[PDB]
Structure to design on (331 residues):
């Protein structure tokens, strides 16, 4: 009696009465998401119904993981958990999980191709980095940052949408079969910043192989040291491409593309868009760069941080919901 | 330097 049902295409959203005005804004293999209005908090929310969370151990494992990280991770620059519920009254009946988040106005896809001043550019990038740093502190490395999984509001605030693991924003480590570390996420920040400046995708590969070619065409073929780190099968392709010199960052990002500040942005870009991760800038150095550091606030940029059966996952998830 | 408080969608 505290709940009601709304049909959402072929899916039924059975939710607390506080949530009205439901409307589907997205879906994927793991869930359906509706925009809604929360009559109790008097604010807009996003409600995600998880998809087939108990179909197998793998689905259950992810559902449990997603739920635990959203609860335990807290930072203004990371999508937060407002509420979690199940419409079922018992563990025996337990089937469905709904996650409630603050409703953001947009992702970054269009915004970054509009023309932003330095202040907006750098402030958005500062917030991204603060968000990413907090993920890394919690032992979460994203590996898949892109504009579509970064959300904003009309008040110029920003949150990262998910905890990760379109190929334009993938680092070289990922493109190829390499090991990664923290600064894998810096590449994606680089691609995004560049795009804010350029007004279009930096490295728009037509396929997974072409993504590499687009990068090296602009940045240059990486040195032999790096080639040695590649697995034999991928090394055979990569090493035998024509040799590109790359263009300087002055040529890639000349003054005329921008709205000292351009010089500072270029310098930072030249340190993030580095193919060889062992030569790429880190998150901490990025936050300390004069282009980003102007917004510095320690409370934001230094914030304090197996095997089961389906029924055991059901129970672990149920406890987490209650 | 004051933080932007608006963003055009
Ligand atoms: C991998 S999965 O679970 O299948 C997949 C399902 C779909 N799923 C989502 C699809 C659509 C929106 C989604 C999600 C997950 C979170 N959101 C949110 C959260 C807060 N605000 C918005 N505001 C929006 C931002 C974008 C704008 O265009 C409209 C307002 N969208 C992402 C995860």
């Amino acid at each position: 009696n505290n709940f009601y049902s709304v049909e959402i295409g072929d899916s039924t959203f059975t939710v607390l009465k506080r949530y009205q005005n439901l409307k589907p804004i997205g879906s994927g293999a793991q869930g359906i998401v509706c925009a809604a209005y929360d009559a109790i908090l008097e604010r807009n929310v996003a409600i995600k119904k998880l998809s087939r969370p108990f179909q197998n151990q793998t689905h259950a494992k992810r559902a449990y993981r997603e739920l635990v990280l959203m609860k335990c991770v807290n930072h203004k620059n990371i999508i937060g958990l407002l509420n979690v519920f199940t419409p079922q009254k018992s563990l025996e009946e337990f089937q469905d999980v709904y996650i409630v988040m603050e409703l953001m106005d947009a992702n970054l896809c269009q915004v970054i191709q509009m023309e932003l001043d330095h202040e907006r550019m750098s402030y958005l990038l500062y917030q991204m980095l603060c968000g990413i740093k907090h993920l890394h502190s919690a032992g979460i490395i994203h590996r898949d940052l892109k504009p579509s999984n970064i959300v904003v509001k009309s008040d110029c605030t920003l949150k990262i949408l998910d905890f990760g693991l379109t190929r334009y924003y993938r680092a070289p480590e990922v493109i190829l079969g390499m090991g990664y570390k923290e600064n894998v996420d810096i590449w994606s920040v680089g691609c995004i910043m560049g795009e804010m400046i350029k007004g279009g995708v930096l490295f728009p590969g037509t396929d997974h192989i072409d993504q590499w070619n687009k990068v090296i065409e602009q940045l240059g073929t990486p040195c032999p040291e790096f080639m040695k780190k590649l697995q034999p099968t991928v090394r055979t392709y990569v090493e035998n491409r024509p040799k590109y010199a790359g263009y300087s960052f002055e040529k890639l990002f000349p003054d005329v593309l921008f709205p000292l500040k351009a010089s500072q942005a270029r310098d930072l870009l030249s340190k993030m868009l580095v193919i060889d991760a062992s030569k790429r800038i880190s998150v901490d150095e990025a936050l300390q760069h004069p282009y980003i550091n102007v917004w510095y606030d320690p409370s934001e940029a230094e914030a304090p941080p197996r095997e089961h059966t389906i029924e055991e996952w059901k129970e672990l998830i149920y406890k987490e919901v209650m | 330097p004051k933080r932007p408080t608006t963003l055009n969608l």
Q: What stands out?
A: The pocket of 1J2 is lined by residues A 25-31, 33, 46, 48, 79, 101, 103-104, 106-107, 151, 161 (CB under 6 Å).
